[PDB]
Amino acid sequence: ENIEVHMLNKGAEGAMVFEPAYIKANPGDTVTFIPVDKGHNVESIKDMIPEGAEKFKSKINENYVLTVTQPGAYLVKCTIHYAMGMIALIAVGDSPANLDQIVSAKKPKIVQERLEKVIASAK
């Protein structure tokens, strides 16, 4: 199945957000990122995707279809607005083995707070 995600300048959680910011998917699903506001992209974060997965980076303002195969958790960002907290978490399959590692990893304090809300007030 397909899961559609919007990239927005402003949303429920504030400025520069992905909606939804928590995405549950199964191997073989697709995640479609739609730039409803311009100035955004999607890129996988170094060491914050499962082992075996390839990294990716889309073009600014492009509609991007991501096919997820390897199970685990994926933290993705908007390259442009990562420092302002623009991130989304994709969880592929149940009990993603690297999720605690991702939560502990080093990242901007604004992104850390949003990530904690996605796993709490999101799952």
Binding site residues, Cu ion, CB under 5 A? 40, 78, 80-81, 86
| 81 known ligand binder | yes
Question: Of 83 and 97, which has the nearer Cβ to Cu ion?
Answer: 83
> Nearer to Cu ion by C-beta: 16 or 48?
16
Q: How far is the C-alpha of 25 from the C-alpha of 3, rounded, in Å?
A: 8
Instruction: Rank residues 68 and 81 by Cβ distance to Cu ion and give the closer one.
Output: 81
DSSP readout, 12-38? TTEEEEEESSEEEE-TT-EEEEEESSS
Q: Determine if residue 78 is labeled as part of a ligand binding site.
A: yes
Is 6 part of any known ligand binding site? no
Shortest Å, Cβ 42 to Cu ion: 9
The sheet carrying 22-25 orders its strands as: 22-25, 87-92, 72-77, 43-44
Least distance from C-beta 78 to Cu ion, angstroms?
A: 3
Contacts of 121 (CB under 8 A, 6+ apart): none
Q: Which residues are annotated as a binding site?
A: 40, 78, 81, 86
